Design a protein around this ligand. Sequence first.
Ligand SMILES: CS(=O)(=O)c1cccc(Nc2ncc3cc(-c4ccc(Cl)cc4Cl)c(=O)n(CCO)c3n2)c1
Ligand SMILES: [Ca+2]
Ligand SMILES: [Ca+2]
Ligand SMILES: [Ca+2]
Ligand SMILES: [Cl-]
Ligand SMILES: [Mg+2]
Length: 456
Amino acid sequence: FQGHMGTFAERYNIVCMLGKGSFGEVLKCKDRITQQEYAVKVINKASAKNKDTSTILREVELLKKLDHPNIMKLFEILEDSSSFYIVGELYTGGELFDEIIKRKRFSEHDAARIIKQVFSGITYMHKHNIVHRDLKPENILLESKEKDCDIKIIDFGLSTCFQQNTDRIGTAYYIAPEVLRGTYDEKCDVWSAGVILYILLSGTPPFYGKNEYDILKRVETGKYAFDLPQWRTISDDAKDLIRKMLTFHPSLRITATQCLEHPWIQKYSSETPTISDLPSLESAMTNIRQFQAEKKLAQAALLYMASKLTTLDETKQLTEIFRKLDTNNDGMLDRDELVRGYHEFMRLKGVDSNSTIEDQIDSLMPLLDMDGSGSIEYSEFIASAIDRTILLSRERMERAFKMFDKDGSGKISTKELFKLFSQADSELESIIEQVDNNKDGEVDFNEFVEMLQNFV
Ligand SMILES: CS(=O)(=O)c1cccc(Nc2ncc3cc(-c4ccc(Cl)cc4Cl)c(=O)n(CCO)c3n2)c1
Ligand SMILES: [Ca+2]
Ligand SMILES: [Ca+2]
Ligand SMILES: [Ca+2]
Ligand SMILES: [Cl-]
Ligand SMILES: [Mg+2]
């Protein structure tokens, strides 16, 4: 039956080639059922593999678990006899490098918006023991052509698994001196972010040169200056941050967390909700109450399809709200950020906050935090703040069904567990017997749809 199913070719349809990037070619594919468009990375196995396939799929699964508004999202890892297909989210805003050429320089307010996002993502990777090792504006992408949309760190984590064959001069600006000597610790990323921040505020690399040689000579010494005329107008806080990031010795260099919490970042990045946000903000809270009222099985099903099958355009309204609720700018919503946001929501309507808000969130946190990470990441937030009618469109339920049905036509009780277990991690077969009108014992597509609509 599967003899002619293609795994990757079964689900996706290649549309065009975007480019050729180090490890492999990068294509724009399109889901055949849902019509959503993604970016896939095709990497020839025989030519690129340093390790075995079991080890590779282990690393890429770890990457599929990274949920941060400023880190690339990988949906799945397919495979055929010749290549690995790494399906990920498509970003259409271009490289930050192009944004630097257009604007040529950034006010401290704008540069703090961009760099705050690079710090939050880099902090997330480091906590998950991931080092970019090649952080530069060419590997940061704006998610859209909207004005102040998020940036996205891409192209990382593949070094241990694959081999790269290759604009090398561009990379020389951002390497740390210890890389010239063979070290690639977490601190090398902080350095790169510091060179980026220097470039945002002046338009000149701190270690400059027309060729690869001269640049590397200035990097080795680690000497830079604020001598350009345009630095006379730039604040002392900014310079103190750049100096801390470009400390020669990694042991004395500050961390990504220290970059994010630096005062300069707090001064120019205090985004907060306004009266205009009230419509979308109230829709999120109402759907979050409906979330906790639903059962554990229903909540896990909504999280599976909110994290595996949605796209950012559908959640553009909720992306802005999530950003405004993220006071510490670490990319996640802790308990305190939910209570304060729910309180401001009251003050903007004109209602007194005085079941209390604090005791509501206390009960709501275990339900939304289905991974137990201590905070609500973006996927869990949209799973609860989104209109369920959106999540359960027909085309999106078709894909869900085919994901679990190995073989054809029928979903076993065992095969069905994959949906709920992937999210909640907590054996109720009641919904199975209720969803099976034909007494078949397995759930075809129409019984599958009826089951999901009850969860709404
Ligand atoms: C090429 S392009 O023509 O410049 C061009 C035009 C217009 C848009 C894009 N967008 C884009 N969106 C997502 C991605 C994801 C990856 C990627 C890397 C490593 C792993 Cl493990 C998984 C993934 Cl999915 C990627 O490599 N690239 C290519 C570099 O940008 C990606 N590009 C690109
Ligand atoms: Ca460059
Ligand atoms: Ca937070
Ligand atoms: Ca969580
Ligand atoms: Cl100095
Ligand atoms: Mg049946």
